[PDB]
Design a protein around this nucleic acid. Structure first.
Ligand SMILES: Nc1ncnc2c1ncn2[C@@H]1O[C@H](COP(=O)(O)OP(=O)(O)OP(O)(O)=S)[C@@H](O)[C@H]1O
Ligand SMILES: Nc1ncnc2c1ncn2[C@@H]1O[C@H](COP(=O)(O)OP(=O)(O)OP(O)(O)=S)[C@@H](O)[C@H]1O
Ligand SMILES: Nc1ncnc2c1ncn2[C@@H]1O[C@H](COP(=O)(O)OP(=O)(O)OP(O)(O)=S)[C@@H](O)[C@H]1O
Ligand SMILES: Nc1ncnc2c1ncn2[C@@H]1O[C@H](COP(=O)(O)OP(=O)(O)O)[C@@H](O)[C@H]1O
Ligand SMILES: [Mg+2]
Ligand SMILES: [Mg+2]
Ligand SMILES: [Mg+2]
Lengths: 325, 174, 348, 130, 546, 329
DNA sequence: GCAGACACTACGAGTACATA
């Protein structure tokens, strides 16, 4: 039936075959499940890569719908997970048998980096003592906020960023299941602006399809507000080729015409600053100045002065690069 | 506390060597009939980093996922350690070589590591790095100044590149 | 009653200076749909006088009958905090900075209860109430972020008149929601005219040279000018042209502190200067005013090619003092950096 | 002149204000010709109670009566009504007066010496435009 | 060269042009049943291992109770104060003037052993009350009152009860108040009380330190400890040279219990001769000690005297000592208050500037961690002391004082704020709204006091001129406006004075500022009498109006 | 019949009245028809219309009677701790979607949680929103509104569809201001409206406030450029020329005099930074001097954004531009 | 049948710390 859902939740990989990228990790987890050798897992990686979807597909594969509420204990950062919960419901769930059917139980701890260190220290002997009865899956974005004692007990899988070559067919499946007219440059802009994230590629696809009705390069870069590659090349050419006043006028006209933001301009100019074969003394100064300009934009600071400083960081090094020869 | 340590004999365990891990892993392999090669067990010892739990977990994961222990089967599921490359990028920052340091930083960024984990490994390497003491203190102060910005909300590749540029500037400015 | 409070004007038509702004403020508040106001200017310019004149123009003469109201507010840490409030039958005057870092609890709890309720009598009182948030530049950004939806939701029944010295300490979401009213300091002629009218209403005679020297020494602060004129009247009734004007102790203590800085550049002198700066911070002097006095006295001793560097160091350590929490570290760092620069300049 | 004047028992009104304390922080008083309706809408749910036509009792202090015509619906705070019901046993009855913009008036006729009045301003209504 | 004058042939390029318009191109692309400590525990006075001065002082202090406990007249620097208190006499209640003995020192010395041996040596029965008890004030009271206020249940010949309170520094402040109340009941205390702690500078024991016979334990001598360990090894049949025993002694920081436990683990029965490399290894016997604040400051500000000469070992040693000491803010305050008192060789003040930059870095990190709730920024302020070790390391002998300036300044600022609020709350609310307390403090205080102090002759108002009467009327009007008055104050020198009841002179005046003429006693008494008659005249005028 | 200020009288009641934000308005108008509304993250400069757009969308979607049952609006004026997110927001998201519109208009089958001013929420309270947004997405929607997207954590950035509210261009802002002035029977000249849209800098709330205050000041007569310059706090060009002449003099006493004269006249330091920046980028200085001076201007603006003192920052900026102007002399 | 005494858990309050 038709449902009113966001496309990041309407199109969720309910099975392990619907995830795209981490084929070796998913093959190893599938062979863990099929041989009943599932250990305590530690899924870590950047957001939007499919860790919660992986553990929910594994839990739906392991357990039927008539027994899913008694075998799976799913706790996350929206739940209270203090040390009284580790000593309370989690220990009682781990230390007791099942109700309906005999089997091993699963305690999913989503956002395990949000737990306090007291709870993580209390979890160690709960994990180690009841390995036969229950299994634990810790999922985090930052591995440093998990204590090394819990990192030793759980085998860790790095759910790295999704490569855009493998991100395309899932987006094509979502497009063909939603009747969306998309061009090749629209798909390329989607997998460029996503940057290893399938949430942001679905959100941007749904937002562009609602705003314009078609998904092309211009529509995606207009709905997102991101500058194009040609605009960044023009900004760099103006900052390296002419004086302060003409470059300031041209960049100000380009920003007023297309409604660009200085954060995305700074990000793309930072990406361009390493491809350009600059001297090493020039690159250090440019990176320090651009990091300072990016830091100044985090508060109530006028963006026009920061645009002038972004021009100034290159107008300083123009004559240095030229006289270097 | 000090009275409890005075009331007991304080035995201290050190990290297990590669031969000590290898002996127990060969015992587990001969008990489990795991086919293997020498580079695979070398990769397991490399990914264990003195941890027998991680050695057994990585061996069981590789044997369940692939059924054979070579280097690429281990590294398709396991991961190389972070400080082994963070030490190289800090060494590149000591010699004011910003290009190789940014190459290692971008390699760690494309692997999905958050800025907090990267700057934690950078501080961990710089705490015990072998260099001048005053330069080490300047490095640690610049790491803390960057980490305040990382914790306050701004955490991009430009901020880490600016941190690397400031670390390379600290060398050339006595 | 002193001369600062005896001859304060009561209505907008009785202001000695900024008369065009007085007419514009009378035309602004006549209809009753005027937005929130942000009265900003230097200290002693006459901001609070114009705010009370705006309140008289809005309500009756009952805004001069004020009273102290005490409120107890519960923090999220469950610490009961007592806050005083100047109140009338038409308006309230709150200074949330007395709660310090808990000022947000004043904004989230005490202010919104004022905003969410309509008035008792709508005939003697008007259709709206006024809340005067005094010294909003000392508010934390959490309180200023708690202020904005209260200012936007209930602005048809509660108007607000924020008062500050510098609008740079007010966040742009708050400054976008209110009309900014600038009250500049009166000039030397305006202060001389005010002092002459006060002395004529007291039945005294004031020379023009003495009034010019009072306006020069007050640094365009009319409150300090009136206090200095009354102190000069007390200490010597015949007004001589070269009469000695009394001075504040913390200002001359700051001058002696900067003389002690510039006299010797040693760590022992730095430890003595740090003791003097604790003495200054002990008496509840704000550290930015200590930094301004130190700069204003140390620039009289520097050469022409050092004043820019000294001013840049003073601004840098003032900004680092604002970013931090212990003022003595940044004050002593500024003094040590100036001592190093001064020693380098004098030995070379 | 108030648009609604009603009479209530004092202890019953104190119990009514106390029962809505555990539900929400702001109560709604409605007064039509039928009687007086107390409501308390919160995150838990609405608690609605009514009093009407209690003149068939032996005691003269339990006669809940209506005396005016125009119905009113006004939202008030809870703590001020609790402090108003802190002065209950001085009088046998209590009188409530309401209008479109006039504040709620809670009147006690304390024996023979005199009387006590409470004025409570209503809350600012939400933006319920169509 | 990264910059090419000629454009590239195949690779992509990016132009760079200077201000003079010349183009450049860049590339875009039961011996076995017990422990050895319990087996070799001292049971007599002659086999103790503590300092003999402390043993004699504790024995003499316990023998001072024989006149009131056993009912017999005859029993059978820091040292000078103890010797004076041992011979200071008795109160008329036949007791020593210090009724409680406090034993303090580092762990592993023999404080509990000395207390038990001295109590059993003087004919007392030891009553122990340690940290494993409940330590609530009711339980503390009902145990001290039971142990001290009763006689023996064995009748005649029963031993008296000597209450030994172990680990008193872990007790709450209310339990110490209960102990002091039972010590100062005049319900008279008739039995000696011995308190044993590990840190004398705890905040809960300071009120005890003003009343107790403070006995401080020095660390044990290495020669006696080496001889005792040699005797233990000879009793157990193990051979060890005194050099390796001295190595254990310096490894465990003169801890008897740690050395005996280390020998018990290291001997076992496999080998008889102990080796140097077994003690020198860090695997057995090394424990983390809690360094004192003064030891950390001495390690930071002074180099170790002459391997250990490398700077990296000193770097890690100072870092680990400052990390293991604890109380980080106290270390920061001590470094802030002690680094300018040294004989600094940096005459250009660059080291002072970078030290103050490091202090500001610490302050910014503390503010950011307490603002953003991100406490993973709290790994860097541990490098604040070690930075000072790179800046101000000297071979001299610095005199390190305890930090007091940031607490004294905070207390004075709090009292100044209380005085400001007390001044502000007395003014009328009509004039309170016209000025903030900050502007009233900065602008309207010294000039206000100059207004309030005119030139007045010490003569009666009757002889004053009409102008002087008008000036006095203005003076009492502005005194009554701000609710300021003069009241009489007592002095130990015998002279009454008049002072303002809100003492705003300490708000206004400064220490090093030139002196000004104060008002005389007659003028201030005249002002006080005038303000009293003006208040009563104002009351009569308000009664006449109403 | 009480008067109301024009910022609330001309608030957009429907989504058709929102100006210049065409992409988010088109998304919300598609969601009005019945399209799948995703989670929203509005971010941009102040006064661009982030709150008004979502309130107009909620009023169009639910009508008057369902606003209290389908919309939970939490802002920084109320307590949003970890327990408010864990208890209040989760229990609101777990509620049923009941209640239908009585006027026959269609009603969407979800609730809306408007977490306005999400900058002030902590990282733990933002981390507690993640599975609340993901798990309860069938029955509720979330709209985080902020000014800085860097202060919102990357999981919440990923979970929401990001829309940046651009500053309003001079065409759309001038058209809206002329429509408001036409509806209020006030006349404003072309120079006045040009200076108004120059001064307001894409802040439509500031423009409406300035237009209302200029109407109240003049009484309803013609609004010229002079009243806009008076009420906008714009420093005259004579003061800027005097500052630049004091910097070209090379003497610090005249620099202190002009800085003290600008401070005593109560001029805001942000306005002085803007006008000095325009003069510096629009003169014939060298590129190196312009570069250093604009970098110092950016640093001074950052320092003033952190609540530093105006006098010291302005005297540091004036010392820097004096050094640059006297370097070539 | 009703007043007094017993332990019982829920709740209010004070304090510390949060890193490698
Ligand atoms: N590998 C993937 N294959 C298909 N869809 C994906 C994949 N990764 C992410 N998605 C989409 O993103 C949604 C949410 O992914 P999640 O399971 O939350 O990812 P995650 O990496 O666990 O995110 P965090 O780290 O918890 S914010 C899914 O329901 C899909 O719509
Ligand atoms: N002369 C001695 N020969 C051998 N062992 C001894 C000797 N004196 C003391 N000991 C042992 O060393 C330890 C002395 O510590 P205790 O007196 O019990 O407590 P403490 O010395 O106060 O140290 P703390 O602070 O309580 S850990 C005990 O284990 C004694 O058995
Ligand atoms: N795009 C717009 N279209 C129409 N009126 C607008 C627009 N933007 C702002 N306004 C007007 O300005 C007022 C302020 O709009 P808001 O929506 O509160 O701005 P904002 O986005 O909330 O700014 P912040 O970030 O909360 S300070 C509205 O009530 C309208 O009167
Ligand atoms: N127009 C005026 N005529 C005479 N005196 C004035 C006038 N305006 C202000 N003053 C006096 O100057 C002082 C300014 O203080 P205040 O009104 O509180 O302004 P601020 O809040 O800026 O210090 C007041 O004490 C007042 O008596
Ligand atoms: Mg997830
Ligand atoms: Mg002991
Ligand atoms: Mg808003």
């Amino acid at each position: 039936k038709i449902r009113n859902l966001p496309w990041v939740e309407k199109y969720r990989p309910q099975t392990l075959n619907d995830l795209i990228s981490h084929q070796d990790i998913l093959s190893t987890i599938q062979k863990f499940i099929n041989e009943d050798r599932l250990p305590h897992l530690l899924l870590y990686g950047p957001p939007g890569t499919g860790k919660t979807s992986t553990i929910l597909a594994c839990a739906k594969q392991l357990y039927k719908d008539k027994e899913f509420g008694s075998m799976v204990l799913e706790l996350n950062a929206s739940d209270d997970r203090g040390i009284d919960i580790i000593r309370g419901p989690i220990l009682s769930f781990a230390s007791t048998r099942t109700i309906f059917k005999k089997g091993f139980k699963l305690v999913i701890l989503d956002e395990a980096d949000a737990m306090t260190q007291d709870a993580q220290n209390a979890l160690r002997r709960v994990i180690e003592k009841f390995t036969e009865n229950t299994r634990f899956c810790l999922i985090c974005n930052y591995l440093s906020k998990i204590i090394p004692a819990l990192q030793s007990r759980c085998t860790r899988f790095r759910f790295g960023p999704l490569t855009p070559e493998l991100m395309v067919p899932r987006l094509e499946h979502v497009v063909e299941e939603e009747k969306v007219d998309i061009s090749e440059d629209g798909m390329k802009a989607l997998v460029t602006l996503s940057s290893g994230d399938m949430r942001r590629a679905l959100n941007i696809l749904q937002s562009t399809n609602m705003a314009f009705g078609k998904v092309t390069e211009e529509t995606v870069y207009t709905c997102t507000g991101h500058p194009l590659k040609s605009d960044i090349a023009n900004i760099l050419d103006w900052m390296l080729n002419q004086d302060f006043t003409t470059a300031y006028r041209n960049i100000t006209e380009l920003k007023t015409l297309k409604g660009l933001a200085l954060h995305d301009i700074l990000t793309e100019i930072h990406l361009f600053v390493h491809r350009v074969d600059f001297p090493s003394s020039v690159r250090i100064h440019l990176l320090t100045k651009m990091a300072d300009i990016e830091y100044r934009l985090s508060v109530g600071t006028n963006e026009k002065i920061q645009l002038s400083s972004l021009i100034a960081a290159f107008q300083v090094t123009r004559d240095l690069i030229v006289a270097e020869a | 506390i000090e009275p409890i340590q005075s009331r007991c004999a304080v035995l201290r365990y050190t990290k297990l060597t590669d031969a000590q891990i290898l002996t127990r892993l060969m015992n587990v392999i001969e008990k489990e009939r795991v086919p293997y090669t020498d580079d695979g067990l070398e990769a397991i010892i490399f990914t264990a980093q003195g941890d027998m739990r991680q050695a057994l977990n990585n061996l069981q994961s590789t044997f369940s996922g692939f059924g054979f222990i070579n280097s690429e089967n281990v590294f398709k599921v396991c991961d190389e350690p972070h400080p082994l490359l963070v030490k190289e990028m800090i060494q590149h920052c000591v010699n004011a070589n910003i290009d190789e340091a940014y190459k290692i930083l971008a390699h760690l960024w494309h692997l999905g590591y958050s800025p907090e984990d990267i700057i934690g490994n950078i501080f961990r390497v710089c705490k015990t790095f072998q260099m001048a003491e005053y330069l080490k203190l300047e490095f640690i102060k610049e790491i803390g100044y960057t980490h305040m910005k990382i914790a306050e909300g701004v955490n991009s590749l430009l901020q880490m590149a600016g941190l690397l540029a400031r670390l390379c500037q600290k060398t050339m400015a006595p | 009653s002193l001369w600062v409070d005896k001859y304060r004007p009561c209505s907008l038509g009785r202001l000695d200076y900024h008369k065009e702004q007085a007419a514009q403020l009378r035309n602004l508040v006549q209809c009753g749909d005027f937005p929130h106001l942000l009265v900003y200017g230097p200290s002693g310019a006459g901001k609070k006088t114009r705010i009370m004149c705006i309140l008289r123009e809005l309500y009756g003469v009952g805004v001069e009958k004020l009273r102290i109201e005490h409120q107890t507010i519960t923090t999220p840490s469950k610490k009961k905090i007592e806050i005083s409030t100047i109140a009338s039958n038409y308006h309230l005057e709150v200074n949330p900075s007395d709660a310090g870092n808990s000022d947000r609890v004043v904004i989230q709890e005490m202010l919104k209860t004022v905003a969410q309720s309509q008035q008792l009598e709508t005939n003697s009182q008007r259709d709206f109430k006024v809340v005067l948030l005094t010294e909003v530049d000392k508010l934390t950004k959490d309180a200023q972020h708690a202020l904005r939806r209260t200012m936007e939701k209930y602005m048809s029944t509660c108007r607000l008149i924020l008062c500050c010295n510098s609008t740079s300490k007010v966040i742009p979401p708050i400054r976008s929601r209110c009309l900014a009213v600038r009250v500049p300091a009166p000039s030397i002629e305006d202060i001389c005219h005010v002092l002459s009218t006060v002395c004529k209403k007291e039945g005294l005679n004031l020379p023009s040279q003495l009034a010019h020297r009072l306006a020069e020494k007050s640094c365009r602060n009319l409150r300090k000018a009136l206090l200095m004129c009354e102190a000069c009247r007390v200490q010597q009734y015949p007004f001589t042209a070269d009469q000695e004007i009394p001075e504040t102790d913390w200002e001359v203590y700051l001058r002696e502190t900067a003389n002690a800085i510039v006299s010797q550049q040693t760590p022992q002198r730095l430890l003595e200067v740090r003791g003097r700066l604790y003495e200054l911070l002990t008496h509840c002097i704000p550290p930015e005013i200590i930094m301004k006095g130190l700069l204003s006295e140390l620039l009289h001793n520097c050469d022409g090619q050092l004043k820019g560097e000294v001013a840049q160091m003073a601004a840098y350590y003032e900004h680092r003092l604002q970013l931090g929490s212990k003022a003595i570290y940044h004050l002593e760092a500024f003094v040590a950096k100036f001592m190093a620069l001064y020693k380098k300049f004098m030995e070379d | 002149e108030y648009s609604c004047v009603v009479k209530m028992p004092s202890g019953e009104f104190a119990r009514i204000c106390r029962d809505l304390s555990h539900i929400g922080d702001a109560v709604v008083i409605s007064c039509a010709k039928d009687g007086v309706k107390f409501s308390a809408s919160g995150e838990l749910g609405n608690g609605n109670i009514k009093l009407s036509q209690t003149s068939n009792v032996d005691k003269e202090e339990e006669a809940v009566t209506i005396e005016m015509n125009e119905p009113v619906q006004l939202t008030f705070a809870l703590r001020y009504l609790n402090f108003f019901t802190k002065a209950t046993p001085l009088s046998s009855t209590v009188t409530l007066s309401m209008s479109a913009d006039v504040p709620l008036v809670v009147e006690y006729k304390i024996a023979d010496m005199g009387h006590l009045k409470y004025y409570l301003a209503p809350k600012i209504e939400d933006e319920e435009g169509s | 060269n990264p910059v090419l004058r000629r454009p590239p042939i195949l690779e992509d390029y990016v132009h760079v042009t200077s201000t003079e318009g010349v183009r450049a191109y860049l590339v875009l692309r039961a011996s076995s049943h017990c422990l050895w400590v319990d087996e070799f525990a001292p049971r007599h006075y002659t086999e103790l291992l503590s300092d003999d001065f402390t043993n004699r002082c504790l024995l003499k202090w316990l023998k001072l109770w024989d006149l009131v406990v056993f009912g017999h007249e005859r029993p059978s620097s820091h040292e000078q104060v103890l010797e004076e208190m041992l011979e200071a006499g008795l109160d008329p209640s036949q007791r020593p003037k210090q009724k409680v003995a406090l034993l303090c020192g580092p762990p592993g010395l023999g404080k509990t052993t000395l207390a038990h041996v001295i109590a059993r040596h003087a004919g007392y029965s030891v009553v122990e009350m340690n940290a494993s008890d409940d330590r609530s004030p009711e339980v503390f009271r009902t145990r001290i009152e039971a142990a001290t206020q009763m006689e023996s249940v064995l009748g005649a010949g029963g031993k008296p009860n000597c209450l030994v309170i172990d680990e008193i520094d872990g007790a709450p402040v209310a339990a110490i108040n209960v102990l002091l109340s039972i010590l100062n009941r005049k319900g008279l205390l008739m039995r000696p009380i011995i308190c044993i702690c590990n840190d004398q500078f705890a905040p809960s024991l300071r009120q005890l330190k003003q009343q107790a016979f403070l006995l401080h334990f020095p660390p044990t001598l290495p020669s006696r400890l080496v001889q005792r360990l040699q005797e233990v090894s000879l009793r157990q049949g193990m051979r060890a040279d005194p050099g390796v025993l001295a190595a254990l002694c310096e490894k465990t920081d003169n801890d008897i219990r740690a050395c005996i436990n280390t020998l018990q683990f290291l001997y076992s029965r496999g080998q008889r001769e102990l080796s140097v490399r077994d003690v020198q290894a860090t695997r057995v016997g090394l424990k983390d000690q809690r360094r004192g604040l003064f030891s950390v400051w001495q390690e930071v500000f002074q180099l170790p005297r002459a391997s250990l000469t490398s700077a990296s070992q000193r770097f890690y040693r100072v870092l680990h000592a400052a990390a293991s000491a604890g109380e980080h803010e106290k270390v920061v305050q001590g470094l802030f208050d002690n680094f300018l008192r040294l004989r600094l060789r940096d005459s250009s003040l660059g080291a002072v500037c970078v030290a103050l930059d490091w202090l500001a870095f610490d302050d910014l990190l503390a503010g950011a961690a307490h603002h953003s709730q991100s406490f993973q920024l709290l790994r860097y302020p541990p490098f604040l002391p070690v930075a000072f070790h790179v800046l101000f390391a000297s071979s001299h002998t610095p005199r390190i004082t305890f930090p007091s300036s940031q607490q004294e300044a905070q207390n004075r600022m709090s009292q100044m704020r209380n005085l400001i609020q007390t001044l502000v709350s007395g003014i009328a609310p009509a004039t309170r709204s016209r000025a903030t307390p900050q502007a009233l403090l900065l602008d309207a205080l010294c000039l206000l006091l100059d207004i309030l102090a005119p030139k007045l002759r010490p003569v009666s108002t009757q002889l004053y001129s009409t102008r002087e009467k008008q000036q006095l009327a203005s003076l009492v009007g502005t005194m009554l406006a701000y609710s300021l008055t003069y009241r009489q104050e007592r002095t130990p020198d015998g002279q009454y004075i008049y002072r303002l009841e809100p003492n705003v002179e300490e708000l206004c005046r400064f220490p090093e500022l030139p002196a000004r003429k104060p008002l005389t006693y007659q003028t201030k008494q005249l002002i006080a009498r005038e303000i009293e008659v003006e208040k009563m005249r104002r009351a009569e005028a308000s009664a006449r109006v109403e | 019949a009480k008067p109301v200020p024009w910022v609330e009288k001309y608030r957009p009641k429907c989504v058709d009245e929102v100006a210049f934000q065409e992409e988010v308005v088109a998304v919300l108008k598609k969601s009005l028809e019945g399209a799948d509304l995703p989670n929203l993250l509005f971010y941009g400069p102040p006064g661009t219309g982030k709150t008004s757009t979502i309130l107009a969308a909620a009023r169009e979607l639910f009508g008057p009677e369902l606003f209290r049952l389908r919309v939970l609006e939490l802002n920084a004026s109320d307590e949003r701790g970890i327990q408010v997110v864990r208890e209040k927001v989760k229990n609101f998201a777990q509620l049923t979607v009941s209640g239908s519109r009585s006027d026959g208009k269609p009603c969407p089958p979800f609730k809306i949680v408007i977490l306005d001013e999400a900058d002030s929420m902590t990282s733990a309270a933002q981390a507690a929103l993640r599975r609340t947004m993901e798990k309860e997405s069938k029955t509720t929607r979330f709209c985080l509104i902020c000014n800085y997207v860097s202060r919102i954590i990357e999981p919440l950035t990923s979970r929401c569809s990001k829309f940046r509210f651009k500053p309003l261009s001079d065409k759309i802002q001038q058209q809206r201001l002329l429509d408001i002035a036409k509806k209020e029977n006030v006349k404003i000249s072309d120079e006045g409206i040009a200076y108004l849209v120059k001064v307001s800098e894409g802040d439509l709330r500031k423009a409406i406030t300035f237009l209302q205050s200029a109407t109240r000041l003049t009484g309803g007569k013609e609004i010229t450029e002079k009243v806009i310059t008076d009420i906008a706090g714009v420093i005259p060009a004579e003061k800027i020329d005097g500052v630049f002449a004091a910097c070209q003099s090379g003497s610090f006493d005249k620099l202190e005099a002009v800085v003290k004269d600008l401070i005593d006249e109560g001029h805001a330091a942000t306005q002085l930074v803007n006008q000095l920046h325009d003069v510096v980028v629009e003169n014939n200085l060298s590129d190196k001097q312009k570069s250093i001076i604009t970098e110092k201007l950016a640093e001074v603006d950052k320092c003033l954004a952190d609540g530093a003192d105006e006098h010291l920052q302005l005297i540091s900026l004036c010392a820097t531009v004096m050094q640059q102007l006297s370097q070539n002399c």
